[PDB]
Structures are given as C-alpha cells and as structure tokens.
C-alpha cells in the first residue's frame, strides 16, 4: 500500500510549468501570448536582459 | 613693589583649498553619467518588445 503511495505521489507531482520572470504588469504577456503558445518562432525582444535566462 | 599684568588676547583664521586634479581615466567612467539612467526607462516604463 505504502509503495502504491508513493507511485502516486510520485505522479502527481511530475507536472511542470515554464515561468515567465518579469516585472508585472504588460510587458510579457504580449509576448507569451503572440509569440510562444501560438507557435511563433523569431520573436523580439528589448536587450533589457530579457531572457538572459530570464 | 607690586606688579600686575592681563594680557587678553585672541585669534583667528579660515583656511581654504581648491585642489582639482585631473585623472585620465575619470572620462571612462564617465562616458555613461546618463546612460544607465535613460534606459531605465526602456526597462521600467517601455515596451521591450516589437
């Protein structure tokens, strides 16, 4: 049983989100939205650093 | 014979220097007084983005 639990919590804590690190509010989520999960290759950036691992 | 003497006295003096001395790498350091301010605003304020 206690094996069984931790394939379980295993499982369920193998779940992954890729973090955006900004400033908040309008700077990043134009980019995210036009330019990441809608596909897009070569999007521009300002060279404030801005993913210099960001 | 009695003898006395006061000798009240007092002074003063204001001092002052000028020095300004001219190194040659003071310019390297300050080619960018007023850069690390003006894109402060490109991180802070401005869309870094096309």
Do not use: H
Not at chain 1, 29 to 40: D, F, K, P, T
């Amino acid at each position: 049983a206690e094996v069984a639990l931790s394939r379980f919590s295993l499982i369920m804590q193998a779940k992954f989100s890729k973090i955006f690190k900004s400033e908040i509010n309008d700077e990043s989520i134009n980019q995210l939205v036009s330019e990441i999960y809608n596909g897009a290759p070569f999007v521009k950036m300002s060279p404030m650093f801005n993913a210099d691992d960001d | 014979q009695n003898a006395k003497r006061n000798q009240n006295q007092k002074g003063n003096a204001k001092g002052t220097q000028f020095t300004k001395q001219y190194l040659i790498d003071n310019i390297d350091k300050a080619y960018d007084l007023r850069k690390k301010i003006l894109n402060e605003f490109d991180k802070k304020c401005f869309l870094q983005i096309w």
